[PDB]
Amino acid sequence: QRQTTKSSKRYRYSSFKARIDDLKIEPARNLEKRVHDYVESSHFLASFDQWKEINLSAKFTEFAAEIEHDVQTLPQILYHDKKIFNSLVSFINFHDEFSLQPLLDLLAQFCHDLGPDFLKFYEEAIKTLINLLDAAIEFESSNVFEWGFNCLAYIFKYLSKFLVKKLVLTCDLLIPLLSHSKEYLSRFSAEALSFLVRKCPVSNLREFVRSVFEKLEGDDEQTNLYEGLLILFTESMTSTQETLHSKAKAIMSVLLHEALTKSSPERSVSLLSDIWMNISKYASIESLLPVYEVMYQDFNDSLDATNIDRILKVLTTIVFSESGRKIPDWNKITILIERIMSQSEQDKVAFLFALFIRNSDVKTLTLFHQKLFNYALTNISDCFLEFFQFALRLSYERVFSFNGLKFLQLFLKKNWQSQGKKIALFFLEVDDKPELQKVREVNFP
Amino acid sequence: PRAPRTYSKTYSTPKRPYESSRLDAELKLAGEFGLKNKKEIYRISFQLSKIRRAARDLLTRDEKDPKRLFEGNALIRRLVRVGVLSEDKKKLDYVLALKVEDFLERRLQTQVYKLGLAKSVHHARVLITQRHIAVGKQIVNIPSFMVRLDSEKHIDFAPTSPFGGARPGRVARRNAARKAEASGE
């Protein structure tokens, strides 16, 4: 229970964790009268003059002395490129908060001026930034976290096309901050790199997805990298207020293919499933429908391989996600189910069938319930009793309005001698509940 | 429970208020300088009485006493800035020999009449209080303004007025609108 009903006073306390949990990153979600984009004699010089007025600290005053003698114009910046940057990096490594605000703003704007020539300072700029952020962990300051990650967002935004072309080196740089063992570091770094992921086109995106799945199998033992990748991709898809967009459906297609390859890790398939879970909980069905089309399309493309259990994993996630309120057509889902069954020609099958029995539509179950229980009776033969106990625990009255007793009797007639102890355990469970009197009523071989 | 602002009486009736010589004196002063009040003449005579009393006491004190030097130099420079005491008379004896005609000549309506923005002293008074005359940038409409020397060079008509500047007054432009409509009919 976070602070929900605001009070009448004006100055709340707002502890540090509350401020971080309130904090987000996107300055394009934000907006104001941006001074550096507003006045244009030189971006660095405009921001420098505003901060010379605003800030009165010893460290920024010394920096102001040096570089105020150096820069007054754009060829002066373009010539003394190295001196300015090394002085900036010197004071950021001096690590003083009162001066840490304007130097971060100036680093962003200095890159904006020095655009496609910044790519030689860019690496150790990022290094000093992440060292600053770990120092900020040591001295808790939501201000410092907000400034530093806004500087990273600005650098990504200003050098979009080049880092997009070279995406795998950027995440190779940010993995010490993406897989960091703090929830907010992984959250913010994932949001920034998520903006770049949204900006990237399809081919470099495919390369990046393949590389990051390989890196996740490398960090099999790590779970916080998994969580960081999850929050990264889900924000790249969800980025708007209620509607994921066309870049999100393209991202979903790329992730679907490169996860349904026979080389991708099943942990990465679980990551794809959790991404789909977050998206299904977030977005509405009108904005969701083309993503559903893409998913059904890619299922029909690659349904026939050694990836059938993998398809089953993603499909169980789909049918579970929230309810039928996000699912367009259980008829198409039924076609997929029969396709997967005919291709299979176990436990996940029982889970899928139980989730379909509980969550799907009765108007489709009226014509699929025969084939469903026949698929269960054929394929998951030993598992059918476990499936039936799970179904009765999830929703008993649905199968009871349907034909649970008859299919149970047919299963008993077909097979009783292999798992009679399992039969006894099932009946031993179903005695105590007063809601299974038809199961108390059923007949025997 | 506030602190009291201080007020002060600016004039003072003389000892014998009815005396033929002083009545004709004030008639001469009022008609010559365009005044309106024994109140105004007593205002100036009270200021001059205070000044000459201070100067007399600084005379009676010892020469090169620091009290005399300090207060006498301050009094002399204030009078010189007013313009009543000239440059070459920078002494407490001439401060003793000043008079009401000097002060009423440093007033503003006398300066406007003397510089020639007005035909008479009463015309000068009317101009000032109709807000036509500025001293530098500031519109003054007080006929007892006591200019200094630099200000005395700076007196001129005001940029708001119809006389040294913008659009004519309501009488002129109403007459012009009337003549325009009468030529239209």
Binding site: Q72, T73, P75, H112, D113, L114 | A166
Partner: protein, 200 residues
Amino acid sequence: ENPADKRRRLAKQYLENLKSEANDILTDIIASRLKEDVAEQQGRVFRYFGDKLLISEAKQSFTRVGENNLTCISCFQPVLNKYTFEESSNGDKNKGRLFAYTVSKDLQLTKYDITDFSKRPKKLKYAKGGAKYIPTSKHEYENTTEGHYDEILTVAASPDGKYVVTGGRDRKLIVWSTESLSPVKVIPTKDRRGEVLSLA
């Protein structure tokens, strides 16, 4: 396609020109040139040609004019911005054409071309006053007759190369365009003795 990249491109061409001029001078330096082109902005004298001048051979040329009693001259010289990088002059048909504007007691304003430092000032265009611009009220604030009617006395050319403004004993102050010498605006001084003596 981005304005920051356009500024960077103009600055890079400027730096190419600086390195080439440093090489031709050689047949430190670039840093000093940049510090100079900024150091115009600080208020200290820096331009130090006090002894490089050769006055003993300074070539002189009188040019006699037609009207009588030139009163003032102001010459417009186009320079280059350092913040943006286009030029000082407005049009593209000028490209740094040194102009001069002269005003004369004959109520005549005249623009000469002086772009060449060997030939004489060539009279490009002119505009003359006269007595048809005398105000009909003569006693009012309105003095906005489009010409000059008595004794123009000072000229000044705007640095953007669009306007040149002239003022004289007629207590007006007229801003003329720089091409057709057409009077775009006329501001009375609104004073009976407000004669305009010198502009800057």
